[PDB]
Amino acid sequence: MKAAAKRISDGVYWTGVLDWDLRNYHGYTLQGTTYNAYLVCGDEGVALIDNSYPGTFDELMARVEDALQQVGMERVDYIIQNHVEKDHSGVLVELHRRFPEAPIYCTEVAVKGLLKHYPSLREAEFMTVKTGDVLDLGGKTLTFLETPLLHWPDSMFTLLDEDGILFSNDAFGQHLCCPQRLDREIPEYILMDAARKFYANLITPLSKLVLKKFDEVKELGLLERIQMIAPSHGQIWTDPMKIIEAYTGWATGMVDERVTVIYDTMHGSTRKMAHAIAEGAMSEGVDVRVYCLHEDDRSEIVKDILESGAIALGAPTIYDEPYPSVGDLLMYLRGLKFNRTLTRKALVFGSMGGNGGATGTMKELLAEAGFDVACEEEVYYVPTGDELDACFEAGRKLAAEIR
Amino acid sequence: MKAAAKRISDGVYWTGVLDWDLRNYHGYTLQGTTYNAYLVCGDEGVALIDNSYPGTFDELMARVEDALQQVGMERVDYIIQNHVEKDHSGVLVELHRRFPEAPIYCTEVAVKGLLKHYPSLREAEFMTVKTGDVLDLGGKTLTFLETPLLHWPDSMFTLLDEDGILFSNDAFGQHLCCPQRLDREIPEYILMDAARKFYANLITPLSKLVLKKFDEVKELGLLERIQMIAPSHGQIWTDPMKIIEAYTGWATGMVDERVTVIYDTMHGSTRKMAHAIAEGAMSEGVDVRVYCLHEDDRSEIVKDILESGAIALGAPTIYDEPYPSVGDLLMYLRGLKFNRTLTRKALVFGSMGGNGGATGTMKELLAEAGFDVACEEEVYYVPTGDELDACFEAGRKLAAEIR
Ligand SMILES: Cc1cc2nc3c(=O)[nH]c(=O)nc-3n(C[C@H](O)[C@H](O)[C@H](O)COP(=O)(O)O)c2cc1C
Ligand SMILES: Cc1cc2nc3c(=O)[nH]c(=O)nc-3n(C[C@H](O)[C@H](O)[C@H](O)COP(=O)(O)O)c2cc1C
Ligand SMILES: [Cl-]
Ligand SMILES: [Cl-]
Ligand SMILES: [Cl-]
Ligand SMILES: [Fe+3]
Ligand SMILES: [Fe+3]
Ligand SMILES: [Fe+3]
Ligand SMILES: [Fe+3]
Ligand SMILES: [Fe+3]
Ligand SMILES: [Fe+3]
């Protein structure tokens, strides 16, 4: 197969897979992604860091072969698995068959997870690693750093300290599929919006552990030595402090003045309320976003929630419950635990035809999910002018609190 | 507009609207529907029972006009509103303009409902009716029967005594849009499946009240005189006992032997578990359906739950929660209160990568929604043959139970 590797540093090559076609997975929408794998070539040893999704072996191997031919070397001597997730371990079996002599370097928890995914690796050679362990490739050394982060219990960072490259698994990732391999070769808006979305959807509940990981990195004296961050998806950071600083802001609740308004409706009354609420919020000079659960994906909604000090959630009542689509977002938000960054304000609202129940339900669930539920607007059927004014004031007040 | 009314009985015409294009509304999918309005003409007066969605006046008016010509009458004398829902009252304002001298006949609760939707009607002449009130058309009497059923407070039935026709609002409706008007003119499978779907999604939580309403219809001695049921959507029942008996079955929890399996998945492990459970259930000779939340609507899923004594629900864990799509289904089920017809058995299942939590949550929420959660199959990553055998066995045991 003809597929080229990309030299990223001396004896270090990107040898990953471009997934142009993926649009939706893990609960998340995207316009394609990459599975970044890296070939590190020392004086005496060659290490491959991570691999790719099942069925992508030929492409990954073509790039590994090209890299090797570029440096004048021939085998992979070590296979490194910073995580067990199938889009980074999906061709491990094929890799093991191709390089039978290569030990697999990973954490002890990764061994379990890898063997449960791929039982035929019962026969393979593993080298479990712990924080501070080293693999010497001759003139280059890889140091391992466990990053269990509660819910990524197999994960680790690999540090190449002579190039100052951190291979960070999914941390600092973004779902982007570009011909350009580097952060600086694409528009900054695109780069940061994808990085933002990845944080909101994947790192939010881990925010405390991420901050703790940063302090440990700083304590081992590895941070003054980051020249580059090579994540498992998307662009390589040649400006690692840009993404570290953004992450620090996201983990600590640094937001601009923004209110995200989210609703569903059947007959339009909750929609009118949502517009009046957004109108009020706008009058206070804050940024406003409006999403409709009928149309909009949860992963885009939470990207904006990350950057918002306040939200408004509205749905009509359907047999004592909110419209069922809010059950999807509320469950997601209960997993994301935004209170770990900042306990954002929440206004709940909706139309109803008799006994209601949706707004108190949403209050219950928003509070459990770590929002500070500020108040409510509940309307019988179609709102009147006065009721719409009341909606405008609710949004104005909500915007005023987060200024 | 050219559009013909369909003669149904002597001096009784269907004058509704054909909505070919509707696909999704009220949380519900369909392949089109109708808004059935009915013109009833005595020797002296003419009543119009219900109307149609906003913007559909021309079609309704044209059919009304055609009907008045066929009977040789000049105007609608009485406007009957069985319910306020905009599907059925959306051209009331234009009807009031067309027939200024016509009172509006509805329940007292319906007056508030109609005023909140249509403030201009604050001028209109209202004639509130309660159970057992009569309207005489001259050789044709309409008898009114309130049908609040807790959550349809504005609703009523209108009975035409001499012909034995029950105008049953949304009760006994189906979302079908055919050129044929009567139940016996279309395939029985289609008719009953649509009726089933309509009951499952719109009536389930009202089941005990439905049975109380049936008792009252019998107690007023009106059920013996029912020759025909004319609902607000779909086909007219020339065989009214057919749908009455099916409703009684659906309300009392009458089911054939059936398990509905429902799941979502990211990497396919929960799917392997869902298929094993399906195979285990099939080994016991019971019917099985398998739905995937990524693809299938909540309204098709609950249709089959209605007909099932047991369900299985499965999903992977993401940050301590079930995959978010189950939050939508679970919240819907919470509205529907299936335990009001029958407490069905449930099996929760799922694959996880660490601490899990999805099966715990799903067990909790299903119990809230009134299912008897009898078994829990949780697997770490990809299931072994033995773990797949245990899912098969759990499927088998669930099936055995409901025999
Ligand atoms: C399927 C169905 C069930 C409903 N159930 C309830 C209910 O249990 N309680 C209630 O107060 N309103 C109920 N409603 C009435 C709606 O909440 C009401 O029409 C509301 O004004 C809709 O707001 P929207 O314009 O944003 O869709 C129900 C409506 C439908 C279609
Ligand atoms: C975004 C993400 C978050 C996850 N969080 C958890 C978690 O919190 N706890 C856990 O046990 N597994 C977690 N998992 C791992 C999956 O639950 C595990 O891979 C499982 O086997 C998926 O099953 P499936 O093949 O049906 O998709 C997570 C996976 C992803 C992609
Ligand atoms: Cl999805
Ligand atoms: Cl070789
Ligand atoms: Cl929907
Ligand atoms: Fe994956
Ligand atoms: Fe990844
Ligand atoms: Fe209720
Ligand atoms: Fe409606
Ligand atoms: Fe209706
Ligand atoms: Fe957790």
Swiss-Prot record, chains A, B:
InterPro entries xref list: Flavodoxin/NO_synth (IPR008254), Flavodoxin_CS (IPR001226), Flavoprotein-like_sf (IPR029039), Metallo-B-lactamas (IPR001279), ODP_dom (IPR045761), RibonucZ/Hydroxyglut_hydro (IPR036866), Rubredoxin-O_OxRdtase (IPR016440)
Positions annotated to bind Fe cation 1: 83, 85, 151, 170
UniProt-listed PROSITE patterns: FLAVODOXIN, FLAVODOXIN_LIKE
Keyword annotations from UniProtKB, A to Z: Electron transport, Flavoprotein, FMN, Iron, Metal-binding, Oxidoreductase, Transport
Top-rank EC class of the record's enzyme: oxidoreductase
The protein's Enzyme Commission number: 1.5.3.22
Activity across pH: Optimum pH is near 7.5.
Family label: In the N-terminal section; belongs to the zinc metallo-hydrolase group 3 family.
Residues holding FMN: 265-270, 317-320, 351-356
Subunit organization: Homodimer. Homotetramer. The tetramer is composed of two functional dimers.
Record protein name field: Coenzyme F420H(2) oxidase
Span of domain Flavodoxin-like: 259-399
The protein's required cofactors: FMN; Fe cation
Residues holding Fe cation 2: 87-88, 170, 233
Function description: Catalyzes the oxidation of F420H(2) with O(2). May be involved in O(2) detoxification, reducing the intracellular O(2) concentration to a level allowing growth at the expense of methane formation.
Pfam families in the cross-refs: Flavodoxin_1 (PF00258), ODP (PF19583)
Free-text remark on how the cofactor is bound: Binds 1 FMN per subunit.
A GO term, aspect molecular function: oxidoreductase activity
Record's note on what induces expression: By iron limitation.
Catalytic activity: 2 reduced coenzyme F420-(gamma-L-Glu)(n) + O2 = 2 oxidized coenzyme F420-(gamma-L-Glu)(n) + 2 H2O + 2 H(+)
SUPFAM superfamilies: Flavoproteins, Metallo-hydrolase/oxidoreductase
Domain topic, free-text comment: Contains an N-terminal beta-lactamase-like domain harboring a di-iron center, and a C-terminal flavodoxin-like domain containing FMN. Two monomers assemble via a head-to-tail arrangement, such that the beta-lactamase and the flavodoxin domains face each other, thereby forming two separated and presumably independent active sites.
